[PDB]
Amino acid sequence: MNPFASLTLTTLIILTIPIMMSNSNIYKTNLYPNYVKTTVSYAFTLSLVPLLMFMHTGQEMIISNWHWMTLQTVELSLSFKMDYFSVMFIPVALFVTWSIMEFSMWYMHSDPFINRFFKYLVLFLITMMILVTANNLFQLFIGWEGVGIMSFLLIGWWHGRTDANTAALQAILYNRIGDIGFVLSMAWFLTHSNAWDLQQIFMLNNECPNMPLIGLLLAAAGKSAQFGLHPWLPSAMEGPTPVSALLHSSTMVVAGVFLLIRFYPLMETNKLVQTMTLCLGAITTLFTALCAITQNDIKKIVAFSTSSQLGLMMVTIGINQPHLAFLHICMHAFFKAMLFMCSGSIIHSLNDEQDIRKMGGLYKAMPFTTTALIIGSLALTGMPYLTGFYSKDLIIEAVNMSYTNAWALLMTLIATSLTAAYSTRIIFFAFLGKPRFPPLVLINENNPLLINSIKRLLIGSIFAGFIISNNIPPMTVPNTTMPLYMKMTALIVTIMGFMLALELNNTTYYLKFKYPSQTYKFSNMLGYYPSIMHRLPTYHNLSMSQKSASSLLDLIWLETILPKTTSFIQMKMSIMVSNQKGLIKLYFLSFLITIMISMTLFNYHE
Amino acid sequence: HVTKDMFPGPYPKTPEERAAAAKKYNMRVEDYEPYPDDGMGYGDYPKLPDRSQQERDPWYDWDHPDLRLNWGEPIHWDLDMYIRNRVDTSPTPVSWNTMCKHLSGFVAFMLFMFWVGEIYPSYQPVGPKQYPYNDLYLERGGDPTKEPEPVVHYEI
Amino acid sequence: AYLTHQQKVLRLYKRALRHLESWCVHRDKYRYFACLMRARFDEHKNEKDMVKATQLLRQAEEEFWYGQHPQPYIFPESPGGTSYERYECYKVPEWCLDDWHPSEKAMYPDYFAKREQWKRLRRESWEREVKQLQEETPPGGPRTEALPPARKEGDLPPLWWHIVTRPRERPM
Amino acid sequence: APPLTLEAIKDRVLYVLKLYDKIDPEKLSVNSHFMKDLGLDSLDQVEIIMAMEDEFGFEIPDIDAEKLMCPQEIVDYIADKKDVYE
Amino acid sequence: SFPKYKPSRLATLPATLDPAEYDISPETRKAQAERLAIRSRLKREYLLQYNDPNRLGVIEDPALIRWTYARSANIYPNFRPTPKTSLLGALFGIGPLFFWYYVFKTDRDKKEKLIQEGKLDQTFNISY
Amino acid sequence: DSWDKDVYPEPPRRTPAPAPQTSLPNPVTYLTKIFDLLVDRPVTLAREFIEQQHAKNRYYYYHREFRRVPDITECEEKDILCMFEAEMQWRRDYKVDQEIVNIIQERLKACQQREGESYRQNCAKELEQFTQVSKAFQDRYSDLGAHYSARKCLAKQKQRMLAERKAAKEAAA
Amino acid sequence: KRLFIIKPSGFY
Amino acid sequence: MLKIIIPTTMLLPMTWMSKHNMIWINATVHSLLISLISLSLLNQLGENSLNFSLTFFSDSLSAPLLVLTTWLLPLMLMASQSHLSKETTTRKKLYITMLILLQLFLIMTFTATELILFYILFEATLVPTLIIITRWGNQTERLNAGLYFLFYTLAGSLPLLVALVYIQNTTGSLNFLIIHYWSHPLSNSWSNIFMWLACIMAFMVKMPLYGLHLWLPKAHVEAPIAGSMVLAAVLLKLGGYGMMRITTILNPLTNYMAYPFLMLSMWGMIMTSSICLRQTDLKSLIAYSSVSHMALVIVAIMIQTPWSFMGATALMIAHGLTSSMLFCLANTNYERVHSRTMILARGLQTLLPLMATWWLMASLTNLALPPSINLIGELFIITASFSWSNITIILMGMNMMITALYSLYMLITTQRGKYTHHINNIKASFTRENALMALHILPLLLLTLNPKMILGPLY
Amino acid sequence: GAHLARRYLGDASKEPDPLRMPTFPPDYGFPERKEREMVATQQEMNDAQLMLQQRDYCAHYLIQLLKCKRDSFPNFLACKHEQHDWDYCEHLDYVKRMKEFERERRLLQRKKRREQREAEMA
């Protein structure tokens, strides 16, 4: 206990040091990107040691040192709970960011604010680490909004980019929709449970977490790009390509999922809430993959796949596979990112182009990336003995070897087939075929940082699943006596989709005329969901705010219901008081009536 | 530089004052068309086409290409939600009714097939995991004082 | 002014073939289909009476309107592209240079020296060009946005400064 | 992106216009009027301008596409598009 | 050319399917001569100041001040007590407050009715 | 430690002494060893300076005492002197009672991590001990309002005590 | 070669 | 508190017979010194309010507002330096006198012992701001602005005066200490409802409350910048300080007649925040934002829970620092562009780097990033309201989401995008307004480190 | 799958109900059915701090798995026979549930048509 917890505290402060040096304006802005490299790589280097004793003895603890609020009965202090999930995620996160911004130094170098750029990834990193290394929801809330506003700024990296500003505007908007459930859980825990720290909430035995569980589910739904809260994740791709190989690549999107596994002690209690997760996760797997199947991009498709994947692990959370889900996330973080800058390496080399329909013939001309993308394409599908094998294949069996609704399984096989089909598609357009690219053959990847950044992710995307699986003891009862086929089905459902796509890729060569199929359009407007949600309800909500609301309620009625009416009433009859013609006969006549009615009539004398 | 005649006037009724607001608002006589006189207070402001800034042609030399507007020309009363970042009125290749029908169908069906799947809960043909020690009576949180109701199972 | 009859078809033919290569994807497949539609475009090149071509317009424009790709290949610098309006966050108007502290202006001495004569060049040019534009403009103002040339002696093209001093497309 | 100068652009367009099988190498000129010097039709003009579309990568506005007649002013148009000076 | 796209308020008829594109009457094409002329001078005057080196600061945008002044000042002078306006005033006025009054009153009454005899979950709640 | 187990009960800690039968020696053992004698050693002697400097000039600080004053029950209506004393006495008792809830939550929370996955069965004693304290707290100070006072709590205490008095007679039947 | 980059006066 | 009162009034002779150019330097430096002296007021005992004198007392509620006023006073002093240069010295000293007089009345208001003395200086703040709003305003409408602001506050002020003097004849005293200590239940007699009412609309008219807020958009968007901050930062909060005071006796009536104002407010901020999203003038958004933020405070006080009161105090102080910043931020843009239209000057990040930051966390504090005191006040309100009613959560949660919607919207429509090329007068950002924003923001993060000082006496 | 068809598209009573069965006394039909006994005592699971779902009868092997694993550090390619006992225990325990599933299945099968035989003979 002298190492480990102290080492984690050392790791999370050394990452802040670049920001402290940055704001101190004593740092040199030129080598600061390389200075950032050394910090993240070192911070990763000290991130390995906290694993060592967890492998050894498995010790876990909570660090709460400086007491912030006393708040009568509810004390507040900064607190990190280091458990299985948090401990081994830090090296996974640390290794990913070090490699992706290693690639980003070569890629993201033609911009004046690369110093300010790399600083932003740093400002993401401590916010994300604040989220994962948390012990009460408020600190996780700190990281939750920190990364969300971080995406807002990073997505809108080009402040002159109108589309990026809209994507950033949608990015936080959907993220704030998720926090509504976070606030709902926040209020319930402080009221019914009267606690904020993770430990007390779990062990208070809140066997009626129905409303909190919905609040937790809504929070993860917004953060993990569930259906209805999905389109921001594709929208985040509008920013710079490294930014797409960042927060929204596989880092920030899984924060809500990390919250889901965090609250697994109470998550399993309600089967209803347990169900709706794998439902929405299943729909994301079908829908987002379906959109990516007939599509004309690279980052968008693998972004849709990420949402399909993001729908995958919390389906397993819906079937009570928390630790297995977390293993899948780290494996997912490995190869999903791994193909991200490989796509970015293609984008940089092929003059910042994204559509597949201008790729081709790149197999021989893009050697190192070709191997990298080829492995990672079906590494997402996870052939035996791979990061994806110990996660995806076990996930498909686990939901099949459990008690779910009839359609829950079918979406999972549909997910595996549909994901693989376009996973083969993007290779076909990119490397195979013929170079549908401009005559100037600039295509090149000789940059050393390009190779080295991806190189460490080959060893990650292939080795990690094996080593981690034997390094982590099992959490649930193993599935031993099993009726054969529902395990082999996961492997096979991958290949006809590959086979169907293979001939589908061949049919592109076929000179047969093609018709505007309904499915082609349907998957290309993302199921027309952004076509109507970003159009109809927004227009109604914005429009009524002016015809009504601003004008009709406030500026037409409120000032007419009190100020103008009373002002007019005084205005109207102040005239009749003051419009006296001055006739003396009329004045004294009024005296006579007032004199007469003073008594007798009004009887003021009685 | 500013005066009432070029200020926005009341609701225009006579055709001469329709022309009067036309030169003030910088269109032609036939291009002036105020909002309906339902009492909403729009008055002399013309009902410009219900379009968005996304519909505007990028190639035209806009004086404000950041939002595709030009100096001097009249602008829309509801320009604010009809600019590039906000809601857009540009045409879509699919018919709006058809794509809305597609959405209102799919999301309705999606719930439907899962709903019947909930009515058909799939499971493996296996027995229950009867846990030892009264399915972990004390361990799960049973009362230490009173004895459990022994959930003790023989072997098959 | 109004788009002429053969001009409107040229616009529709433009993106229709861009739609075709979006559909065909492959170069050879596009080449085969582009030539087939080229002859299809040439099938009724004759029109005689303009009313026939108006009906032929309707069918043609209806064809290429449905002929759009669901996700047509929009180039990075195309309106709505990936790199479109991307570096506008870097271009800054030229007048900002005058709003520089003397230290920065002195540490860029040659550039501000040639900027000064460019500022001077704006002066006489603006003077000459405005007294050039006023009478080059016929009564009733300018009938069109086209702007008259520097057809006089030793004169600069009127209304040139912002065109010439445009923020370069690669501000970096 | 390497500093693509007009000399590379100028060579590429004329080579492609010579490459264009209907504008033969011997009858291609620097100021090649497609309607008059080369005698093509309007549709071929679209094919010519959108050939360099994919061949150069950047975009030609339609209102500038029909105006653009000769390879010399094709060269000058791309010259003012990026603002090349060398 | 297919079952045609039906125009909508949030997605209008395009520049292709619009009848006026192929129904160009002599007066409709004639209309695109003077609107261009006023735009030409309007663009001209903007250039005569935007390209003016003598001009400094900000030029007035008449449309912008027309929009702000009509969106801020000239609504009440053009306002009318029209029964329609009072109708939308009523349902968006006391309506929603009575909506949330009943909702919160019903919630409070339904919530309160079990506190006085101990039927709620309050054992672990000593903060308020 | 300054605190004692009567206030903060720390469950006894056992150490499962290892037995590395594997051919490779453990990497943790000397990894903690090096961490010990390259970081802890400089700060141990540095702390020895800090502890020895505190001994060089050790001043003193005491604990503030509070002599008990008559309660609001025995205090006089409209008498601002005595009932102010009872008011302040009641407020301090509220603050102490707030901290009693804090300690029992701290003891309860410390239990949960100590038993690990066995918190469900091995933390019931601490949970019920907090449960009765919280229930006593709820009838003590909860629901009073933001403007809580000694007289307001006394009314609540009297209201609860008359309700149970009526209940007791009802139970007598 | 090197072109000219234009920026607001950050000395202040 | 005369250790603050005496130096504050001593600012008048010093500012009225200083040199024609030292008035800005002298006023700024010694006002800051008063702020440092006022910082000593942060000390509070367990529950005993600091009873310095018979006619002056303070606790953990008055002092944070007290420091807010004293800390604020140099901020309009530096903000007004920009547009007050073109004025004669005598009129300039008159402007300083109004600000100092406004400060002096504020300190006496918070430190007042009985309600009537509190009422006198409370209302007395109308006079200095009335001159500030009207005499030194910018546009024709400011004349209608002053009357709207004056009558609205006064229309509710007079009923409170009748109720207050009625308190003295019935209870026997109006001192806050005696009132709370001699507190008695208020019956539900039909007279007592109006008795309850007369002590309420005075505080909620200047909050402002939904419906009774129209003076807020008609004054803050239209007052001089210096008057704009003090109006938004503190003057609205005068209702808050009073309402925590007057609620000590008006019980248990609040259970029933809170409803007609509660959902009047609860539908209020959501409605107001919708208007903020669809503004056309810059300062109109922040003004409409201020009432939206003030609306959750109304629920916090009225619900009468200790958690809400702490949330009310924290949101009160946090909003003051925020709303002052955005109003200062709008003033900086308005000065160079000579207008306040939102989309008039979009896309200025490329020319205003430091401003774009000053937009950034000022809006983020308006979005209330964690752990800024804005959320600490806001979240405490949520927990208190949820404990009152679960169905509350959707409403203000949706509000803080539409609050989020606009709070980036001016950031997009003022900084994000492309500059306007015809505009050429955005000069180098002067350090004066620049350092003004620094003095606004650093206390916010500094208080974020130790918020325990601004939750009021209920902490 | 097959049993799903025999219940959904077949007879629900014929197939066991996973959330209700077994519905017959296990000792009935097996005179003196020996109890499935425990190897790892309550304190064994308690001291090992095993999780509840993995605190089944196979947990006796599971603690052996961790203990070789907690002592196989550094190496992770060891610890093979430990699971070979564990998964086989889970393999046979799943068979025990499967046998109980089929037991209740043919329990439902036998009595239903036995009662149907009574319905036929009356």
UniProtKB/TrEMBL annotation, chain C:
Accessory subunit of the mitochondrial membrane respiratory chain NADH dehydrogenase (Complex I), that is believed to be not involved in catalysis. Complex I functions in the transfer of electrons from NADH to the respiratory chain. The immediate electron acceptor for the enzyme is believed to be ubiquinone. GO terms for biological process: mitochondrial electron transport, NADH to ubiquinone. Residues 129-158 are annotated as: Disordered. It is found in: Mitochondrion inner membrane. This is NADH dehydrogenase [ubiquinone] 1 beta subcomplex subunit 9. It is a peripheral membrane protein. Keywords: Acetylation, Electron transport, Membrane, Mitochondrion, Mitochondrion inner membrane, Phosphoprotein, Respiratory chain, Transport. Its main location: mitochondrion. Residues 7-65 form the Complex 1 LYR protein domain. The chain holds residues 50 to 221 of 221 of the full protein. Mammalian complex I is composed of 45 different subunits. GO terms for cellular component: mitochondrial inner membrane; respiratory chain complex I.
TrEMBL record, chain D:
Residues 7-82 form the Carrier domain. Keywords: Electron transport, Fatty acid biosynthesis, Fatty acid metabolism, Lipid biosynthesis, Lipid metabolism, Mitochondrion, Phosphopantetheine, Phosphoprotein, Respiratory chain, Transit peptide, Transport. It is found in: Mitochondrion. GO terms for cellular component: mitochondrial membrane; respiratory chain complex I. One of its GO terms (biological process) is fatty acid biosynthetic process. Carrier of the growing fatty acid chain in fatty acid biosynthesis. Belongs to the acyl carrier protein (ACP) family. This is Acyl carrier protein. It comes from Sus scrofa.
From TrEMBL, chain F:
Signal peptide: none annotated. The keyword Transport applies. Belongs to the complex I NDUFB10 subunit family. Accessory subunit that is involved in the functional assembly of the mitochondrial respiratory chain complex I. Complex I has an NADH dehydrogenase activity with ubiquinone as an immediate electron acceptor and mediates the transfer of electrons from NADH to the respiratory chain. One of its GO terms (cellular component) is mitochondrial inner membrane. Residues 2-13 have a biased composition (Basic and acidic residues). Keywords: Electron transport, Membrane, Mitochondrion, Mitochondrion inner membrane, Respiratory chain, Transport. Disulfide bonds join 75-82, 111-123. Its main location: mitochondrion. This is NADH dehydrogenase [ubiquinone] 1 beta subcomplex subunit 10. It is a peripheral membrane protein. It comes from Sus scrofa. Residues 1-24 are annotated as: Disordered. It is found in: Mitochondrion inner membrane.
From TrEMBL, chain I:
It is a peripheral membrane protein. Its main location: mitochondrion. Pfam families: NDUF_B7. It is found in: Mitochondrion inner membrane; Mitochondrion intermembrane space. One of its GO terms (cellular component) is respiratory chain complex I. GO terms for molecular function: NADH dehydrogenase (ubiquinone) activity. Accessory subunit of the mitochondrial membrane respiratory chain NADH dehydrogenase (Complex I), that is believed not to be involved in catalysis. Complex I functions in the transfer of electrons from NADH to the respiratory chain. The immediate electron acceptor for the enzyme is believed to be ubiquinone. This is NADH dehydrogenase [ubiquinone] 1 beta subcomplex subunit 7.
